[PDB]
Design a protein around this ligand. Structure first.
Ligand code: CDL
Ligand code: CDL
Ligand code: CDL
Ligand code: CDL
Ligand code: PC1
Ligand code: 3PE
Ligand code: 3PE
Ligand code: ATP
Lengths: 140, 171, 48, 320, 80, 52, 63, 98, 120, 344
């Protein structure tokens, strides 16, 4: 449902923490399922058991990225009550990388994730705050 | 009687679904002829006689070569039928049950429009011209020789060129 | 030195020379009138 | 009108030029079997063009001023060094053989273009088809590491299939104890020090692989030393051969055109012989290679395409 | 070429009749006197009703009654 | 189209049976001939983003 | 030549480049309206041709 | 008309779903292309007959002229596939991996 | 974007309306460049085939200098016309709709209170 | 092949795009695509070796299915509006299936896998046609429906073409596979600007053609198929080195050369549509496409690799291969940036 994912921007950050965690968790879970499908097709497993296990591994891993991203961004707004601040998504986005490296066993992905996922996350709130529009309708 | 085209289309879908499951090519051709034979009928039901017998006179000749080719290249010690694999049979009954679930469920959500279960047969001909000659379907195809001659040259060339294309591949 | 294999370019391809040099002069000639005819046309239309 | 699709369309088909004696005839044998005398007589009697065996300096006598070049340009292999020290740390043995194969492959190309151009027969001697015997003989004695036989069979695999085997191969048998006495009598102090075992492997490399394999695609004719002398009879045997069981039968008019185009373009003939397989024995290196190539271009008749080199005296440069 | 034409006639007649009739069908339409009548006969057949046209006092050449002598006629078809 | 060669030469190779009201083989009006004749007249010169 | 030349050349450069700046912005703002509303010569997307409509009376009255 | 086209379009989809999810044969995939064109031919035929578009009747013929030529080329390819592997299988066309 | 403009002839190089513009001077900074490139093309043709450069193809190089300049003049003329049509429509459209491009009157620097940002 | 067959097969390739461009019926546009499919197959199998056969089969089944998805779009439109043209007020689903299938023909990601596979199994020629000539006919379909394509999938295809074309080609040793991953990379750009001012789509197509053709010719001088083989180019024919280096740099977006003009002007036009975010990501990854070109310039021109002894046989003979269009195309690319206003 499109209207469901639209609720993420209905309230300022921190308000309705539980709802925003669910939205991110589902959003990340979808990304895992979409991504996990390619791995099942390209470079397939040796059997269906290993194929579903791979699907579960990515979907739950990706779902973890959304949850910890949502929890950290939402909690960081309740304390330091400044909802319109891109720094919150950076810390929130950073926690995703730390979570990411927790599943994939290597610190390199953990340290890199914070810089990239956090930087991408922070830029996202700048876009919605400054009105950046990706996929613009052609107007010239 | 009203549910006459619907039954043909459903058999066309079931025949094509059986061809989608991809059994050994011998039975794929048999299924394809069943769908093609049904394809001729529903075309006839729409007032068109010439086109109907053409899909059933060109694909028939095609399957002989496919039958010839499959027995020459695509064969196994034990060819696969629709019931050799229980999974294929499982997706065959599921597919048959799937359409009924889709056909039925679409009806309740949308009263009419894409599918009209309540009103069937009423919406098939759309105002034939009761009085008139030269209306028989197939005169339009004959326009390929007059005021539609571009379709004639391009289609004719593909058959012309194709003979050269086939020889080079099989050289 | 005196080549064991006679070079493909032992002599000028005089056919190419005439057409190459000829087309160059024709192209230069057809370019001069076009400029002097378009310029003259430009004066006629927009005035002086 | 460089030969191409245009020439064939206009009436330059090859099948109309072939005659009864438009046959490629290679003469094969051992080190001193006496092929030059038998080969030259075959040419004169049957009106074919003799092609002396491709040595180290073949490309030098085929392109440019027509004289041998400095040994650093025409390969880096010396035949005399091979007999003196075949087990040299520098891979002079394999460089000699691979260089000779590329040379023969170039000569075999020239002969086919001659047959496919004017129809005059060509009588080679020890063409590429019989040139693997030496390397198989070199490997048996240990003059080559196993890693280079594989390279040789790879170069052969890529280039050999696209050429037509010779119509008839003449093998003049000479037993090892006879050739070893013949080598000493020819008076080349560098070649009189070749062991009998090396000569044997050339004989074995002929009767085990070459002789059977060619009979499946050519008409073989085995001859003895006493038959070769006064070779008018070997010519008569060729004059009355029935030619079947070979790829020449199934060559159409256009299959010649595509073979003719490939043979005509020498770079397209030798491209697969210069594949970047980094054998230490064959790699030249960026510093020696730049010196040889730069020094090669600084020669009379070189530095420009054959028609344009002014130092020779070619004229009308400003129109070509 | 007389031998070649009749030698093929003697050995492979089927490929000579095919080429002969192939050229005969191409050339016959140009020479026949009735070739132009193939089009007119297919203009005579009135598959659709001949729609009448109003009169404004300036439509003299079209007939008033169907059986009148001032319109197109098929009298050449009866005698073809 | 991408190349107006047909218009340039004036020859209608395949642009006389684009739509239903396109001079059927015999004078048989395609179903909904009047309606689309009306629509095509409305959207002429007025082009694309003004005829929608 | 002295300060006169460079001073009055720079002035010419400035207007040659202020006019370009003004025109470029009007080019952007003109195209924005033309595509939104096809009121101008540009962005006239194709529409089916009108000359191939057949106008002669047909078989049935109600064409 | 409305009820039958939903069945024809899904007939194409099932045939489309068949030419994508390959199986252990390459004749079968070419047969699936036949069904896709079979669905496309009838849709054009019904629509032309439904709308009484006798000027559009030539189009469905031309689809068959070209779709069947794809089969002619497709079948000729499959001759070369078998003459180099002798099995027609699809997992033998993995030699371009590198 | 100008393809559908009214009075646009199809697949025609220079419309009859395009001759009402000044033709290129034939020594323009960019027609000489086409000739200079053409010379560079001719020099490199000789370079790629081991021919002497600046010496071998004095009839090929003459052909390239003329072919590029000859082509450049006609292509340059077309572009001069295309930019003429773009400006012709751009200003013409501006007249018809004053309500979209009002003649705004800017305010002199005496009145506007532009802010100040000290450096310290 | 023989001249009669060669004439008919080539003449069929030429009618493919010509019919697609000239015709107005989308059906004749589709019939133009079929000739390109059918006529290409015999050439790809001209060698008659196992690699070629596998190349032709993948090409055939990938484009045969694509030719059917487009046909569904055309037939469904005939149901909806009764015309054979993609007019306005058409279902976006019908049109999305079009760009979906047209992407398969072009070779854009995520439908790109078939292209690098196929080009590996065919000679250096027939890669030039497959990557330049065959990719014009599908584009002509989209140029005539440019004010209808969805702004989202049109870009989401362009982005993954840029990435999957750069990342994939970042580790290709085989030259033919590199030239395929450059087509994907550059066809992200032509499709990226398709809804926005399509005129630049052709500009980046023409510039791309002017570059690959000399590159493919540059690899046809010696049938150099790998980075190692082209690393020997200095010993065999060093003349190309000056312009293999420039053309390869130009293909990457370096300012002085005329491959930066496409990336530059495309970024300008997107930047005029409030498209900040997607020009940065698209432009940032373009530099990656300049990496494996820079890797190739090291191997070939700047730093020179070890050669073979037999290579001294190639220098003796004379060459007459370059068809004189290598030179003219090599300078039209790598220069003419001063002539940018005449291009736009
Ligand atoms: C924006 C939309 C508009 C688009 C605008 C246009 C866009 C640009 C066009 C697209 C560019 C890509 C097109 C590629 C076409 C294929 C090129 C090709 O394969 O030839 C390679 C060819 C190289 O061949 P080669 O290395 O010289 O080989 C010589 C043969 O060995 C010599 O021996 P041969 O036997 O091969 O001889 C050739 C033979 C070949 O036969 C034919 O002529 C074909 C017709 C049959 C005649 C019988 O022809 C003849 O000899 C005369 C026939 C009698 O180079 C080209 O011709 C391509 C030129 C590139 C043009 C760029 C255009 C952009 C400006
Ligand atoms: C000074 C230096 C000059 C530059 C030096 C050479 C530069 C080397 C690179 C050249 C390739 C890049 C060209 C890029 C470009 O011009 O825009 C592409 C250009 C952009 O398209 P567009 O301007 O947005 O609209 C095209 C119209 O829809 C199409 O309709 P139209 O009204 O524009 O008519 C097409 C027009 C186009 O004629 C031209 O002037 C194009 C010439 C380009 C040749 C390449 C130079 O006429 C012709 O095609 C000639 C036909 C002659 C028939 C007899 C009368 O692509 C094309 O139009 C391809 C048309 C193919 C026609 C053949
Ligand atoms: C620069 C190349 C020239 C391009 C051009 O001519 O367009 C000028 C054209 C017009 O220039 P302009 O400022 O109006 O010139 C004033 C007129 O000359 C006003 O005087 P005029 O029109 O009466 O005189 C015309 C003509 C004189 O006409 C003649 O009488 C010459 C007769 C032929 C004699 C042969 C010598 C010429 O002038 C010339 O022949 C010399 C060209 C001067 C170019 C100035 C470049 C700054 O476009 C420009 O405005 C400048 C565009 C420059 C962009 C270049 C971007 C690339 C940057 C350089 C990168 C390095 C090269 C490429 C990469 C290298 C690694 C591969
Ligand atoms: C502004 C930038 C201008 C850049 C100048 C480019 C010079 C390349 C000239 C190469 C050459 O062979 O000419 C010498 C050549 C000397 O006579 P040659 O015996 O035929 O040369 C034999 C080999 O080139 C002898 O080659 P090599 O083995 O001694 O050296 C190999 C070297 C090859 O150089 C490279 O490695 C390429 C480096 C990238 C250069 C990219 C620029 O590595 O001809 C000349 O005397 C020079 C003619 C005047 C130059 C014409 C250049 C036309 C192209 C202009 C457009 C430039 C676009 C940038
Ligand atoms: C028809 C179009 C295809 C429709 C999908 C298939 C529907 C039948 C599914 C049932 C399983 C059939 C199967 O697996 O194949 C077994 C059979 C082959 O059986 P068999 O060859 O393995 O041997 C059977 C031996 N006994 C009986 C002892 C077990 O093949 C078929 O069913 C398809 C043949 C065509 C059937 C057409 C029926 C028309 C009847 C008109 C009266
Ligand atoms: C609509 C909503 C779209 C939301 C955005 C979707 C984004 C999907 C994520 C991008 C695809 C990456 C999937 C992936 O994780 O890679 C798996 C697969 C390789 O498999 P493997 O090597 O086993 O995985 C190791 C992981 N460490 O990787 C591959 O084999 C390559 C697959 C690339 C697919 C690119 C296209 C994905 C985007 C499609 C949008 C339509
Ligand atoms: C989407 C989820 C896909 C899940 C894949 C599950 C496996 C499968 O059934 O598809 C694979 C199958 C390939 O066939 P195969 O390799 O032979 O599989 C082994 C059979 N013993 O693929 C096929 O054979 C094609 C199956 C077509 C099914 C059409 C029916 C659709 C209606 C339900
Ligand atoms: N591929 C090769 N590898 C190594 N040595 C070779 C090779 N080919 C030829 N040689 C040597 O080169 C010399 C060639 O002598 P060859 O037998 O060709 O003499 P000839 O003058 O042609 O006639 P003949 O020896 O029959 O009297 C011999 O030393 C032979 O051993």
């Amino acid at each position: 449902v499109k209207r469901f994912f639209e609720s993420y921007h209905e309230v300022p950050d921190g308000t309705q923490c539980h709802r925003k965690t669910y939205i991110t968790t589902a959003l990340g879970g979808i990304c895992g399922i979409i991504g996990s499908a390619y791995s099942v097709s390209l470079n397939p497993a040796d059997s269906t058991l290993e194929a579903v296990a791979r699907v579960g591994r990515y979907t739950f891993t990706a779902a973890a990225i959304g949850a910890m991203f949502g929890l950290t961004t939402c909690v960081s707004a309740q304390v330091r009550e400044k909802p319109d601040d891109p720094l919150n998504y950076f810390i929130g986005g950073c926690a995703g990388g730390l979570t990411l490296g927790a599943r994939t066993h290597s610190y390199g992905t953990a340290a890199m994730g914070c810089v990239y996922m956090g930087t991408a996350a922070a830029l996202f709130k700048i876009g919605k705050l400054e009105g950046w529009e990706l996929f613009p309708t052609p107007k010239v | 009687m009203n549910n006459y085209i619907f039954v043909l289309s459903s058999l066309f879908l079931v025949g094509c679904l059986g061809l989608a499951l991809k059994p050994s090519p011998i039975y794929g051709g048999l299924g394809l002829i069943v769908s093609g034979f049904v394809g001729c009928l529903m075309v006839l039901g729409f007032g068109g006689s010439f086109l109907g017998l053409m899909v059933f006179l060109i694909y028939l000749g095609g399957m002989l070569v496919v039958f010839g080719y499959t027995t020459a290249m695509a064969t196994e010690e034990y060819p696969e039928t629709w019931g050799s694999n229980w999974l294929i049979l499982g997706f065959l009954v599921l597919g048959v049950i799937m359409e009924v679930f889709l056909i039925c469920v679409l009806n309740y959500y949308d009263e009419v429009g894409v599918i009209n279960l309540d009103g069937l047969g009423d919406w098939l001909m759309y105002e034939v011209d009761d009085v008139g000659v030269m209306l028989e379907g197939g005169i339009g195809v004959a326009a390929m020789y007059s005021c539609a001659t571009w379709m004639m040259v391009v289609a004719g060339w593909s058959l012309f060129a194709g003979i050269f294309i086939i020889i080079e591949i099989t050289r | 030195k005196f080549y064991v294999r006679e070079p493909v370019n032992a002599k000028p391809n005089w056919l190419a020379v005439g057409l190459s040099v000829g087309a160059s002069v024709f192209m230069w000639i057809y370019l001069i009138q076009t400029h002097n005819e378009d310029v003259l046309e430009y004066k006629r239309r927009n005035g002086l | 009108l460089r030969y191409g699709l245009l020439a064939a369309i206009l009436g330059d088909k090859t099948t109309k030029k072939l005659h009864e004696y438009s046959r490629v005839i290679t003469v094969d044998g051992n080190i001193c079997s006496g092929k030059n005398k038998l080969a030259k007589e075959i040419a004169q009697q049957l009106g074919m063009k003799h092609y002396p065996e491709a040595g180290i300096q073949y490309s030098s006598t085929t392109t440019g001023d027509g004289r041998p070049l400095d040994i650093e340009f025409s390969g880096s292999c010396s035949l005399e060094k091979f007999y003196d020290d075949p087990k040299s740390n520098d891979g002079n043995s394999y460089r000699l053989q691979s260089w000779l194969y590329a040379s023969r492959l170039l000569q075999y190309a020239d002969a086919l273009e001659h047959l496919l151009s004017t129809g005059q027969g060509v009588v080679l001697e020890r063409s590429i088809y019989s040139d693997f015997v030496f390397l198989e003989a070199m490997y048996n004695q240990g003059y080559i590491r196993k890693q280079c036989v594989d390279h040789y069979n790879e170069i052969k695999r890529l280039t050999l299939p696209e050429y037509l085997p010779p119509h008839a191969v003449i093998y003049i048998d000479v037993p090892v104890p006879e050739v070893q006495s013949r080598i000493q009598k020819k008076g080349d102090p560098h070649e009189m020090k070749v062991t009998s075992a090396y000569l044997q492997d050339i004989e074995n490399a002929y009767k085990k692989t070459f002789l059977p394999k060619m009979s499946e695609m050519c008409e073989v004719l085995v001859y003895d030393s006493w038959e070769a002398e006064d070779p008018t009879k070997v010519v008569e045997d060729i004059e009355y051969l029935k030619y079947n069981k070979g790829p020449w039968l199934k060559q159409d008019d256009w299959t010649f055109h595509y073979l003719r185009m490939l043979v005509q373009d020498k770079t397209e003939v030798l491209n697969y012989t210069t594949i970047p397989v980094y054998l230490p024995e064959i790699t030249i290196g960026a510093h020696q290679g730049s010196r040889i190539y730069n020094s090669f271009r600084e020669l009379p008749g070189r530095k420009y395409a054959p028609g344009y080199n002014a130092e020779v005296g070619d004229k009308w440069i400003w129109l070509k | 070429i007389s031998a070649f034409l009749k030698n093929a006639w003697a050995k492979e007649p089927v490929l000579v009749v095919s080429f002969s009739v192939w050229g005969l069908a191409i050339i016959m339409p140009m020479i026949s006197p009735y070739t132009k009548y193939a089009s007119m006969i297919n203009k005579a057949t009135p598959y659709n009703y001949p729609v009448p046209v109003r009169d404004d006092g300036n439509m003299p050449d079209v007939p008033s009654h169907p059986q009148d002598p001032l319109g197109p006629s098929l009298d050449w078809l009866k005698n073809l | 189209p991408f190349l107006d060669i047909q218009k340039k030469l004036g020859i209608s190779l395949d642009r006389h049976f684009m739509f239903l009201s396109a001079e059927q083989p015999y004078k048989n009006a395609a179903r909904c001939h009047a309606f689309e004749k009306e629509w095509i007249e409305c959207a002429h010169g007025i082009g694309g983003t003004r005829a929608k | 030549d002295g300060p006169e030349k460079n001073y009055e050349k720079t002035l010419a450069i400035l207007q040659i480049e202020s006019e370009k700046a003004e025109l470029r912005l009007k080019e952007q703002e003109v195209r924005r309206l033309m595509r939104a509303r096809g009121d101008g010569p540009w962005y006239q997307f194709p529409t089916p041709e009108k000359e191939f409509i057949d106008h002669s009376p047909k078989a049935t009255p109600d064409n | 008309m409305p009820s039958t086209f939903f069945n024809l379009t899904m007939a194409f989809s099932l045939s489309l779903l068949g030419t994508l999810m390959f199986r252990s044969h390459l004749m079968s995939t070419l047969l699936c292309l036949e069904g896709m064109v079979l669905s496309l031919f009838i849709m054009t035929s019904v629509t032309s007959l439904n709308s009484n578009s006798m000027s559009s009747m030539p189009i469905p013929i031309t689809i068959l002229v070209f779709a069947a030529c794809e089969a002619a080329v497709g079948l000729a390819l499959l001759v070369k596939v078998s003459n180099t592997y002798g099995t027609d299988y699809v997992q033998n066309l993995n030699l371009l991996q590198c | 974007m100008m393809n559908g403009r009214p009075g646009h002839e199809p697949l025609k190089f220079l419309p009859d309306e395009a001759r009402s513009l000044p033709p290129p001077k034939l020594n323009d900074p960019r027609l000489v460049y086409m000739g200079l490139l053409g010379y560079c093309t001719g020099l490199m043709d000789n370079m790629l085939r081991m021919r002497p450069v600046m010496r071998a193809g004095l009839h090929r190089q003459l052909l390239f200098v003329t072919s590029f300049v000859f082509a450049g003049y006609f292509y340059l003329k077309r572009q001069n016309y295309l930019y003429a049509v773009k400006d012709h429509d751009m200003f013409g459209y501006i007249k018809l709709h004053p309500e979209d491009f009002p003649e705004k009157e800017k305010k002199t620097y005496a009145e506007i209170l532009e802010p100040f940002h000290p450096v310290r | 092949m023989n001249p009669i067959t060669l004439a008919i097969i080539y003449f069929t390739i030429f009618l493919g795009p010509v019919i697609t461009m000239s015709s107005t019926n989308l059906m004749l546009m589709w019939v133009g695509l079929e000739f390109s499919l059918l006529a290409i197959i015999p050439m790809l199998i001209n060698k008659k070796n196992p690699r070629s056969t596998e190349a032709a089969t993948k090409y055939f089944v990938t484009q045969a299915t694509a030719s059917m998805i487009i046909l569904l779009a055309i037939v469904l439109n005939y149901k909806q509006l009764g015309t054979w043209m993609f007019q306005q007020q058409t279902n976006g689903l019908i049109l999305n299936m079009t760009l979906m299938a047209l992407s398969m023909k072009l070779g854009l990601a995520p439908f790109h896998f078939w292209l690098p596979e196929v080009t590996q199994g065919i000679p250096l020629h027939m890669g030039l046609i497959l990557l330049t000539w065959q990719k014009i006919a599908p584009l002509s379909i989209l140029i005539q429906i440019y004010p209808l394509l969805n702004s989202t999938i049109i870009l989401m295809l362009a982005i993954t073409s840029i990435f999957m074309g750069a990342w994939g080609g970042l580790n290709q040793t085989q030259m033919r596979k590199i030239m395929a991953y450059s087509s994907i990379a550059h066809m992200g750009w032509m499709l990226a600007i398709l809804p926005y001012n399509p005129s630049l789509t052709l500009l980046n197509l023409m510039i791309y053609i002017i570059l690959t053709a000399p590159m493919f010719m540059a690899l046809m001088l010696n049938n150099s198929m790998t980075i190692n083989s082209i690393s020997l180019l200095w010993n065999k024919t060093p003349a190309m080195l000056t312009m293999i280096s420039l053309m390869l740099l130009s293909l990457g977006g370096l300012p002085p050369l005329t491959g930066f003009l496409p990336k530059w002007i495309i970024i300008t036009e997107l930047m005029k549509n409030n498209c900040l975010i997607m020009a940065t990501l698209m432009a940032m990854m373009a530099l990656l496409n300049l990496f494996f070109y820079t890797r190739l310039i090291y191997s070939t021109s700047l730093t020179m690799f070890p050669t073979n002894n037999n290579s001294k046989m190639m220098t003796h003979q004379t060459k007459t291969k370059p068809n004189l269009m290598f030179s003219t195309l090599a300078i039209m690319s790598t220069m003419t940036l001063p002539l940018a206003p005449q291009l736009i």
